[PDB]
Amino acid sequence: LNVEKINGEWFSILLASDKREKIEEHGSMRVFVEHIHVLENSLAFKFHTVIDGECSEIFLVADKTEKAGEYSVMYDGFNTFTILKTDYDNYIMFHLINEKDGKTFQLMELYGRKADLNSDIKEKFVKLCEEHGIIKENIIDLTKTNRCLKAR
Ligand SMILES: Cc1cnc(C)cn1
Ligand SMILES: [Cl-]
Ligand SMILES: [Cl-]
Numbered sequence: 001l002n003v004e005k006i007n008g009e010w011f012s013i014l015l016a017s018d019k020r021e022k023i024e025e026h027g028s029m030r031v032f033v034e035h036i037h038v039l040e041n042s043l044a045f046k047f048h049t050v051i052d053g054e055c056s057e058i059f060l061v062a063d064k065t066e067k068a069g070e071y072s073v074m075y076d077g078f079n080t081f082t083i084l085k086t087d088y089d090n091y092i093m094f095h096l097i098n099e100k101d102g103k104t105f106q107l108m109e110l111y112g113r114k115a116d117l118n119s120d121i122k123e124k125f126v127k128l129c130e131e132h133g134i135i136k137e138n139i140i141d142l143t144k145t146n147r148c149l150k151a152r
Pocket of ligand 1: 045062073075081096109
């Protein structure tokens, strides 16, 4: 992948986990991307999240690890992630693994360059989730949730 080409503004579209509580309201991973800045050794993210009904910002920096294509970041424990698929100018799919207290879960995210994506791309992401043991009932379409768009 040419990671420089993922730079810029993105929107969170679909959000999925094999630990559903983490992506429900008040879950730590119910976060909405605004941008990804590509740096030499890292990716800098800005997110929003809802806390007690109010939009709030989260800024994270993910560092390259010793494994090609993998990044790590501390947020509600220790996370690693990789990019599964992208065409740079419409969609990107991430796969992240969280560790906390020696337990783990997966998070998968579909971001778009616009506030929504078509049904074809969504469907393909759902199948990719299933390929990781993330069942359809654990995939949330954030376009029908509060994504703090007004806060962007
Ligand atoms: C919290 C978080 C979620 N997703 C990515 C890709 C990075 N950080
Ligand atoms: Cl809480
Ligand atoms: Cl919204």
